[PDB]
Design a protein around this ligand. Structure first.
Ligand SMILES: *[C@@H]1O[C@H](CO)[C@@H](O[C@@H]2O[C@H](CO)[C@@H](O[C@@H]3O[C@H](CO[C@H]4O[C@H](CO)[C@@H](O)[C@H](O)[C@@H]4O)[C@@H](O)[C@H](O[C@H]4O[C@H](CO)[C@@H](O)[C@H](O)[C@@H]4O)[C@@H]3O)[C@H](O)[C@H]2NC(C)=O)[C@H](O)[C@H]1NC(C)=O
Ligand SMILES: *[C@@H]1O[C@H](CO)[C@@H](O[C@@H]2O[C@H](CO)[C@@H](O[C@@H]3O[C@H](CO[C@H]4O[C@H](CO)[C@@H](O)[C@H](O)[C@@H]4O)[C@@H](O)[C@H](O[C@H]4O[C@H](CO)[C@@H](O)[C@H](O)[C@@H]4O)[C@@H]3O)[C@H](O)[C@H]2NC(C)=O)[C@H](O)[C@H]1NC(C)=O
Ligand SMILES: *[C@@H]1O[C@H](CO)[C@@H](O[C@@H]2O[C@H](CO)[C@@H](O[C@@H]3O[C@H](CO[C@H]4O[C@H](CO)[C@@H](O)[C@H](O)[C@@H]4O)[C@@H](O)[C@H](O[C@H]4O[C@H](CO)[C@@H](O)[C@H](O)[C@@H]4O)[C@@H]3O)[C@H](O)[C@H]2NC(C)=O)[C@H](O)[C@H]1NC(C)=O
Ligand SMILES: *[C@@H]1O[C@H](CO)[C@@H](O[C@@H]2O[C@H](CO)[C@@H](O[C@@H]3O[C@H](CO[C@H]4O[C@H](CO)[C@@H](O)[C@H](O)[C@@H]4O)[C@@H](O)[C@H](O[C@H]4O[C@H](CO)[C@@H](O)[C@H](O)[C@@H]4O)[C@@H]3O)[C@H](O)[C@H]2NC(C)=O)[C@H](O)[C@H]1NC(C)=O
Ligand SMILES: *[C@@H]1O[C@H](CO)[C@@H](O[C@@H]2O[C@H](CO)[C@@H](O[C@@H]3O[C@H](CO[C@H]4O[C@H](CO)[C@@H](O)[C@H](O)[C@@H]4O)[C@@H](O)[C@H](O[C@H]4O[C@H](CO)[C@@H](O)[C@H](O)[C@@H]4O)[C@@H]3O)[C@H](O)[C@H]2NC(C)=O)[C@H](O)[C@H]1NC(C)=O
Ligand SMILES: *[C@@H]1O[C@H](CO)[C@@H](O)[C@H](O)[C@H]1NC(C)=O
Ligand SMILES: *[C@@H]1O[C@H](CO)[C@@H](O)[C@H](O)[C@H]1NC(C)=O
Ligand SMILES: *[C@@H]1O[C@H](CO)[C@@H](O)[C@H](O)[C@H]1NC(C)=O
Ligand SMILES: *[C@@H]1O[C@H](CO)[C@@H](O)[C@H](O)[C@H]1NC(C)=O
Lengths: 337, 337, 337, 337, 337
């Protein structure tokens, strides 16, 4: 009789689950059951360009109405043990573009079932997915990626189930509390639509994040070493022309260090058949240091015929090389920013 | 009687599963049950030559008839819960060449069961399979590979089960929309045959992709550094031979850099017993960058006898080495393309 | 009645579980059930800065009261086989910041169930969890980090369940015995509070450690080589200005070694965008060595026309560079202390 | 009664499974149950020297008799659904030297149960197992390994179970089609015996392969480059003793290239304490090139005071070094071949 | 009534398991049930310092007495199917210092249940456990480590369970059959005791191994290359000092090659906050080669003012450097042996 009577609530639940067919969706053979979805993103763990995928952790909650679960006489929202979820109908909601996802199970399966007097069911899961995000790296590291999560019903068509973002544009929360060390979340968008496969029309909810890659790490790691090596190569121009060994050592060391600057990129990137921006900058710097070495080679080659022309070429280079490199940096940074 | 009446539909389903035996195939003791199949390829995640295998995610659908699951009076197709598959007969379809595969299970098992009024079952799964693919790397990285997927009945024979592609060559979809950064899909084929083993004849469906590898990554990662190091080695010919330290440093550094490139390349690949094209090109570049040092030694040797021939050798080498390298590259690229 | 009468104990347990409903929490529809918690930390396996997480193995014990499990006639505590835990109600306690956690299952599932005559339940598990600890590296490697373990009830609000540290500050034991290879644990705090989400107010526990990173390793790895390179670059001041080759070689070696040391440090950390303290020190050392090299270049550029000026500049650099570098080191080590 | 009457077949199967005790082996307490085994090796995925194990995918079929499963009236072999294997007694066959083994489960568990009218059970699995193969690498890469797969009953002794190879020497098939890029299967053997442990005598089966390593990779990666480097080191003997730069450059380049060749293979093998054949050959070649360089050093040292002696040493080296290397090759390739 | 009568044995077993409560330990409320143990070590798969743990495979067998499992009239030891282990009480044995342990499950769970007439139960499992082992790597790679395996009862105190090594000091077998490529098992010990935790005393068994590392691999891969590079610097010493390029190249190449010695070995080593012996030896060798280079540089610097002093420096260097290196090797090898 009283809500504090445990046997009465047990009888209510047993009467709810008596004759319950988990094989049928609510309102079977009639209007489709509408499911509302919310996502509370705990964190985006990693964004791997090598595998071209991002790892996400979220509280994914679905909200629908099963009239078979409506109870009368209890003025409370019955939060039931998660195991009861094995005895109810739940949507066959899956993530279209995932590769490895699971529901956490410590200390129990991270899953929540809550029933409402009007029959409404709230079903929540803590899910860690690894969704595939195809990235265009033509502007790496100054690129801007768009990674999406696609949510769909696997077996039920639009005649049987319908999806919507419960709460409108505020359905997905926690985006502003995401710390990606190498990325920043420019924007996120929610999309709802229907897609027509050969088996019929299926609902679809899309959650898209536009990430922008930072630049500080690459400045500290790649661009500054290349600029400093190029300037060190320039330093040879003020050296006296007679120092053959010194200038050749300068050229060789600069070229080899320029080659070894970014060996750490063959492991952090996939195999792509195009030039990135970092490859363009490295190629330009290598071309400049190699041209400095060739300039000294020409100076040595024509030194004997004209002792003054070698000095003239050195004096011209002292100014021509820095100005040309500055122009190259200007066009490069205006193009990619 | 109306489909809106959920109790009537539940009665019909219970009648369908009343006395149903999951251990007996449809038409047990009779004609083999035809099981059509279709595949929708979501993506080809990776293709690896170190392991000689490719990962493939797909919607795999089986279409057959089980007259024990024939219901009358309902003009609808019953999309049942994914957990009803444990209470039906499903073909023991397996992938003959796979190594490790699984069915995605978030939020629930990615599985679809649909029944039809004439007792016809559609059974769909979402499967990520890592299938082996032996590769002929004799023409790597300009190689063209052929990777297959062999679908077979495990226990039942051709006297109990038959396989065919549902819809002919249109039975496999999504092939043209596969994003492979390194490869490109030239052609895909479908074959249906029977294979004889000691236990009898088994049905067999073969799906085949011909993959053409792209060259840009290796052009910008292996060939270009080798050409640059070869030119750097050539640089020593314009250095006057009295500058001993310069030429010694150039030769030693170029030889060591070529060795490093070769070591990286051979540590990025498995241990095949034949010769790869990239190995041939690296060996040719190594031969050239060692002939440069041996030419310096030749100059230092014939310099004892006559000094004019010492300079004549350098003058001739400045023309010979670029021309010989150009001819070598010409014949190499004309053969392997 | 007899303690040795195992049949009587079985009858008592069957009476306890007769009509028991695992779907209903103790005192359902009434006051929240106070679940006290204890943790015995066996070990912290590893603290990873690259993945920003730490692995923790612990004995996690929950302690609550269920009147349905109260028994009489047995003046003893019933330590039951852990497989009875599947038939009782247990809190849906989870860890908010974990990424991959499991319960050890050899030889049996590492689990303990103990029942007390008054109805008290003790429920112990052995858990290994990879908790995500976001780290700020602006002072690395002289940084003091704060890594937390958050404990929450997934589906029950504060109306249903309440968490507390059973024993106060002594609830978590074994912290002093943790042997971290790199860090040293300074302090740990236990915080009991409540949090608010759109679904209501949830209880929260927090076990926080403050870790002070040991400095000796990075002192002997990332600082001594830099200081040695700086002093070796200083040695170039005592070299006479006639020997251009030796001073050029010293400058080249010092600058390129500083760059290689920067890369060596970079090969050990994630791709954070901000500047670390060690990065600042490496930049300072590079500035000093580059200044020394440019000073030599200046002397060489004007030594012939102004030899006394060159000698005076060399002496003043000899006396200035150690002083300025020592001042820089003192101010740097004062800034980060 | 008819084979097409599925109800009669279901009745027969249910009658067979009525009263069946999965806890008792067939003919419990009487003569041991005879289990015959066949293996159809699909492929050998990899043979790893570092891990000392090999991966093996096979169709493993067991064949025994159980009178409790004998049926009459149906003159057909009943190929039952795989799940029925969970309701029958099956031998506790396990592989003694495996590390990680599993039965494939897509789209169903790759399991086959076939019953025969006399009670004969045929039980087939598709197992992928990584079995440890401790290798002897004292003759690597000219080694010849012997890798075995051991099959044993875990619980039942020879008083309760016996093993035999069903088919004699034709029990294992598919060996002739194994495609190992690096190894070739010289021979395979079948062994049957009993092994005595403290708990009694257990049946044992052994499937042995003798793998012979292909030498083409090591010929094209180790031996040929080493021979070429040794010859190019000999080349310096024809250079004049005064040409210190060229001869010392030749020596240094040859020695460092030999070091690189040694360094190459060390990353794909375990840390075995003994000496491999490649280690011996590379040690010999390194000694040869080092002796060439040291001979030039001695010639340079004694040239100023004893020029004719230096010329004699060069001339004698021109003969001794090729002769000694020929002798070393002869003895090395007689000992290891 | 015969031992070959299967239905009689089934009646006996059903009588045994009728009225059997798996939730109660044997002698509940009475004296603790002694549980003897044995281990048959199959192998030690790997030992890792990166994770500081070892993978150990064993047959772990438990021996206890359950009066409720006593059968009469059958003079046989009933070896039951492993599935019956799910219907029996088994000790809550767990390995205290493991990280990821599992039980092999092909072709069945590697599990043995054997019942004796007097109620005795033998329960055997095959377990692959990754046990944690903290290592003192100060004397690496000449260290002797001690790795343990701690076996303990989880939920039962010393008043409910007692452990003892069944057989005495011969309770663990197969130790001498363990083949570790890099380690040799000098000794193993068995310890039995009680540990007093907050909830009273708990039984504890400990199996300890001592492993002495094999020094041969590091001799063949680390020490010999460094010694050879030092001898190469000594070779550089003997060259006539007027050959600038030769000695410069030899010194620089030796320095760089010495810097690039244990790069492969550092990868598979931790970030331990102390210096290993290999690091000290490599630092000493680098110091020696750098000192050789500096000696030559000083000789070249002062070789035009006092050639008589430069010749003396070289004569004394040729004696001091080998003697100093030999003394360093003597003291190093005496300190760590
Ligand atoms: C990463 O990249 C993806 C694309 O690859 C972006 O996704 C797109 O986002 C835009 C919104 O920014 C989507 O545009 C909207 O699509 C809705 C659904 O379209 C379907 O249904 C309608 C009928 O309802 C069909 O006409 C249509 O063909 C589709 O089948 C529309 O309902 C939206 O319409 C809105 O605007 C129009 C005016 O433009 C109004 O008239 C409408 O009333 C309504 O307000 C709109 O067109 C687009 O569909 C998305 N693409 C895909 C493939 O889904 C991500 O946004 C991007 N990431 C980020 C962070 O931006
Ligand atoms: C990657 O490599 C694989 C092989 O390793 C290729 O697979 C082969 O594909 C070809 C088609 O391109 C297959 O050839 C076809 O086989 C069919 C089946 O043959 C079975 O049945 C017949 C009887 O009907 C038996 O005689 C035979 O032994 C088999 O048991 C045939 O029906 C096809 O016949 C076609 O051609 C003939 C003329 O030659 C016509 O008369 C027919 O009407 C018909 O048009 C055909 O022969 C071949 O069997 C496949 N091999 C395997 C092992 O599967 C992949 O194609 C390749 N990848 C790519 C992208 O090409
Ligand atoms: C690592 O970083 C974390 C934060 O990310 C630190 O955790 C914080 O720890 C402090 C304590 O050091 C916490 O502050 C404490 O909060 C308690 C709870 O207050 C909440 O709940 C009550 C109701 O129960 C509300 O009334 C209140 O508004 C809050 O919503 C308080 O009870 C504590 O009070 C105690 O201290 C104050 C003085 O500070 C006294 O006046 C009180 O009498 C009492 O003794 C206290 O305020 C803080 O909430 C924690 N943060 C989070 C996010 O949980 C870790 O400490 C840090 N690691 C280390 C090693 O320091
Ligand atoms: C890789 O290396 C393993 C060893 O590490 C090899 O395995 C051995 O193979 C040989 C055969 O080449 C085996 O020898 C044979 O054993 C059979 C079983 O005998 C059992 O029973 C007797 C008692 O009846 C016991 O004494 C014995 O220990 C066994 O328990 C015998 O039946 C065989 O008999 C043959 O020789 C005798 C004479 O000696 C003749 O009278 C017979 O007619 C017959 O010709 C034989 O003795 C040996 O047991 C295997 N050992 C193991 C541990 O497996 C692999 O062969 C090798 N791999 C390859 C590819 O060669
Ligand atoms: C790797 O390192 C571990 C330690 O980290 C070593 O393990 C230790 O091994 C030694 C033996 O070499 C153990 O010493 C023995 O401890 C036993 C247990 O003592 C407890 O229990 C008894 C009652 O049973 C109490 O009285 C006692 O106070 C303790 O509470 C003792 O029973 C043993 O006694 C032996 O010697 C005495 C004389 O001194 C005799 O009278 C006894 O009969 C008996 O022979 C002994 O003292 C030590 O306990 C182990 N450590 C731990 C933590 O348990 C490993 O051995 C090492 N690896 C290798 C290969 O050596
Ligand atoms: C609780 O409900 C049951 C079932 O209706 C009833 O028998 C019992 O008396 C109730 N208890 C109280 C205290 O009202
Ligand atoms: C729905 O079908 C059931 C089962 O046949 C029947 O008992 C019930 O009366 C039907 N409902 C209506 C409204 O006819
Ligand atoms: C089929 O078998 C069932 C069960 O034995 C029997 O009742 C029925 O009459 C049979 N029908 C035919 C056509 O044989
Ligand atoms: C085996 O024992 C059962 C039970 O006592 C009995 O019914 C049966 O007849 C016995 N078997 C034989 C062959 O006597």
């Amino acid at each position: 009789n009283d809500p504090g009577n445990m046997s009465f609530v047990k009888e209510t639940v047993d009467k709810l689950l008596k004759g319950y067919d988990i094989r049928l969706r609510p309102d079977f053979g009639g209007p489709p059951v509408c499911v509302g979805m919310n996502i509370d993103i705990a964190s985006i763990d990693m964004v791997s360009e090598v595998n071209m995928d991002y790892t996400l952790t979220m509280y994914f909650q679905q909200y629908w109405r099963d009239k078979r679960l409506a109870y009368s006489g209890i003025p409370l929202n019955l939060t039931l043990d998660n195991r009861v979820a094995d005895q109810l109908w739940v949507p066959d909601t899956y993530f279209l573009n995932d590769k490895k996802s699971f529901v956490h199970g410590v200390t129990v399966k991270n899953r929540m079932i809550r029933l409402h007097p009007d029959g409404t069911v709230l079903y929540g899961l803590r899910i860690t997915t690894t969704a595939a995000c195809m990235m265009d790296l033509r502007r790496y590291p100054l690129d801007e990626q768009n990674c999406t999560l696609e949510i769909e019903s696997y077996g039920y068509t639009t005649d049987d189930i319908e999806f919507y973002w419960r709460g409108g544009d505020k359905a997905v929360t926690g985006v502003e509390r995401i710390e990606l060390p190498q990325f920043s979340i420019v924007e996120h968008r929610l999309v709802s639509r229907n897609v027509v496969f050969a088996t019929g029309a299926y609902p679809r909810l899309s959650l898209s994040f536009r990430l922008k890659r930072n630049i500080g790490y690459f400045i500290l790691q790649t661009y500054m070493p290349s600029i400093l090596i190029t300037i060190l190569s320039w330093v040879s121009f003020w050296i006296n022309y007679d120092a053959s060994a010194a200038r050749v050592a300068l050229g060789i060391t600069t070229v080899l260090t320029m080659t070894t600057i970014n060996t750490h990129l063959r492991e952090t990137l996939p195999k792509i058949p195009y030039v990135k921006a970092i490859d363009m900058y490295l190629m330009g710097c290598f071309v400049f240091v190699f041209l400095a070495l060739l300039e000294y080679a020409f100076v040595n080659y024509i030194f004997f015929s004209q002792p003054a022309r070698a000095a003239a070429i050195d004096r011209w280079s002292r100014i021509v090389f820095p100005f040309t490199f500055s122009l190259f940096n200007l066009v490069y940074w205006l193009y990619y920013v």
